[PDB]
Amino acid sequence: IRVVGSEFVQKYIGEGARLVREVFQLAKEKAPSIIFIDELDAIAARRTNSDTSGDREVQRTMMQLLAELDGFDPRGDVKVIGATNRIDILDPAILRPG
Amino acid sequence: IRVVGSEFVQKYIGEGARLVREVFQLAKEKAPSIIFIDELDAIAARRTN
Amino acid sequence: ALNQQTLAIVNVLPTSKDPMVYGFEVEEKPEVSYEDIGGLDVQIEEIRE
């Protein structure tokens, strides 16, 4: 699974939700898989609450992301792999052990 | 309710306090409530004058 | 729930029944126990106090 997290958030706010829920559903059926998500630097740091166009979109898409990732893997079925350029600039959210 | 101590302080500041305010509210609404607040040495430091 | 032609509340949907929460992680009733680290038995008794 190849998708970029720059595409996760998209123009005019609340575009959108479907990409976040589809990636994980899609994975569960294609399993064994092997979802790569893929670089997170502005989509899974922290937010202001809120400057409202930026901040809301980014917060929403994070909440939707974390719930799904938590729920299909206590055990393997779909293994999750990923990558990041820097874990310095990103704030705890996915750096939580859940 | 979890506060990670790494989200504490910037180099000019205000969000660090804001999330303290936030969890304080979440705690009152959901009484009784326990706020685990790790890690108390990045928000506390010596007294000076 | 409203009727949109007249803009009036006709019927009322349940209170809550909406996921997603602010100030995560938020966990009502963990099932994680105090036995998960043993041999620090007298320290569980003190935080209980």
What does this protein look like?
This is part of a larger assembly, with three copies of chain A. Chain A is an alpha+beta fold and 98 residues long. Chain A is 32% helix and 14% strand. Chain A has two helices and three strands, in the order βαβαβ. In chain A, strands 2-3 form a two-stranded parallel sheet. In chain A, helix 2 (54-71) links the parallel strand 2 and strand 3. At the B-C interface, helix 1 of B face loops of C. Chain B: It is found in: Cytoplasm. Chain B: It comes from Archaeoglobus fulgidus (strain ATCC 49558 / DSM 4304 / JCM 9628 / NBRC 100126 / VC-16). Chain B: Belongs to the AAA ATPase family. Chain B: This is Proteasome-activating nucleotidase.
